């Protein structure tokens, strides 16, 4: 009786702790491989990629997106919110200088 159910947020905090304690790639390797190949074929058709080049691109994108989500979370907390919304990412990117 009464199956266990964690309250909304504590599981999220446990994932935060787990993924900040760990170092592996958080994006599946084959879809990111395919995405890199699509974005590359728009610049030079019939292109080949070193495997380490794709791992370097994946590391760069994971680091960039993690830092962007750090700034996004700070923007959301600034607006007295705990959820991140697209306007948070827009503000963070525009202050960082992309927009």
């Amino acid at each position: 009786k009464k199956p266990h159910r964690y309250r909304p947020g504590t599981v999220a905090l446990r994932e935060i702790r787990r993924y900040q304690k760990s170092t592996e790639l958080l994006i599946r390797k084959l879809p990111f491989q395919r995405l890199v190949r699509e974005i590359a074929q728009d610049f030079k058709t019939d292109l080949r990629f070193q495997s380490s080049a794709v791992m370097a691109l994946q590391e760069a994108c994971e680091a960039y997106l993690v830092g962007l989500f750090e700034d996004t979370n700070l923007c959301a907390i600034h607006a007295k919110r705990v959820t991140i919304m697209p306007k948070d990412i827009q503000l963070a990117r525009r202050i960082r200088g992309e927009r």
């Binding site: 900040q20 304690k21 592996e24 979370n73």
Partner: peptide
């Protein structure tokens, strides 16, 4: 950025 270094553990 450091490859496979992860991030510094912090929670707001």
């Amino acid at each position: 950025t450091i490859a496979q270094g992860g991030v510094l553990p912090n929670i707001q």
